Design a protein around this ligand. Structure first.
Ligand SMILES: Oc1cc(Nc2c(-c3ncccn3)oc3cnccc23)ccc1Cl
Length: 262
């Protein structure tokens, strides 16, 4: 059972980026893989706890829409190993290379993302950092959600007001995840990052926090169905308790997706 990987088995290739506490590379281990390494010398005791948490959470997950955890290693450097997703993150498609998807496809990405979140929530995992950067579109047709510095039982911008204005012990909850999901529905349906006409991050954080600013839902593609626009507003509720949980979101998308081809 134990998912540890003996030194030297794993080969490290292209540096590709960063993620919650570490650098990400393309590697090879029984095929090619994603490797998240924390590559210092002595590991922090705090990062030691952070590393052991993502691993703990990942080895709890087995689902198409969740980035497949494959293994970990400690020697030489602490490293998580997951499947390689060819293609790119949803963020990358939408805001960098500008892949223009179609509504049927965009709705599908929405459903699959909703799918993995229900699973996550069913097994009592809270992501606390859902955003299009963390949604990889593998072979350009399957969504894998994947970054897990988070809880069981700054990218702004996807943060609910409650999270923004850290007033109380635990702001993070199922509803905050639901909120983040809402911003992703926004990016899919508008093709934009929200608040693109404010050029000041502080002002963005201050106002979302006080409930002065909210995503401008009038910006959505005209062929985006009514029910989808309707669903987004519900997800983006300023009041935590006023948001629907993921089962309900999933039934919503499934319904509108079914009566869409026309
Ligand atoms: O938490 C994690 C995040 C990533 N991020 C992955 C990235 C990536 N791309 C750009 C910047 C950062 N990461 O590309 C990938 C391709 N296939 C799989 C995973 C990734 C990888 C592993 C872990 Cl364990």
């Amino acid at each position: 059972d134990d998912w540890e990987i003996p030194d030297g088995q794993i080969t490290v290739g292209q540096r590709i980026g960063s993620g919650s506490f570490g650098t990400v590379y393309k590697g090879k281990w029984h095929g090619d893989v994603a490797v998240k390494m924390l590559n210092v010398t002595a590991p922090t005791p705090q990062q030691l706890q952070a590393f052991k948490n993502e691993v703990g959470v990942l080895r709890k997950t087995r689902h198409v829409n969740i980035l497949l955890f494959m293994g970990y290693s400690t020697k030489p450097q602490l490293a998580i190993v997951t499947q390689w997703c060819e293609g790119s993150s949803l963020y990358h498609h939408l805001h960098i290379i500008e892949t223009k998807f179609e509504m049927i496809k965009l709705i599908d990405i929405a459903r699959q993302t909703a799918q993995g979140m229900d699973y996550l929530h069913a097994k009592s995992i809270i992501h606390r950092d859902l955003k299009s950067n963390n949604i990889f579109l593998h072979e350009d047709l399957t969504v894998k959600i994947g970054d897990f510095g988070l809880a069981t039982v700054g990218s702004i911008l996807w943060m609910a007001p409650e999270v923004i204005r850290m007033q109380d012990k635990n702001p993070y909850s199922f509803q905050s995840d639901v909120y983040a999901f809402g911003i992703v529905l926004y990016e899919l349906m508008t093709g934009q990052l929200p608040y693109s006409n404010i050029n000041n991050r502080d002002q963005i954080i201050f106002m979302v926090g006080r409930g002065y600013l909210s995503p401008d839902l009038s910006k959505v593609r005209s062929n985006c169905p009514k029910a989808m626009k309707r669903l987004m507003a519900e997800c983006l509720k300023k009041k935590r308790d006023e948001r629907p949980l993921f089962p309900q979101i999933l039934a919503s998308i499934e319904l509108l997706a079914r009566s869409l081809p026309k």
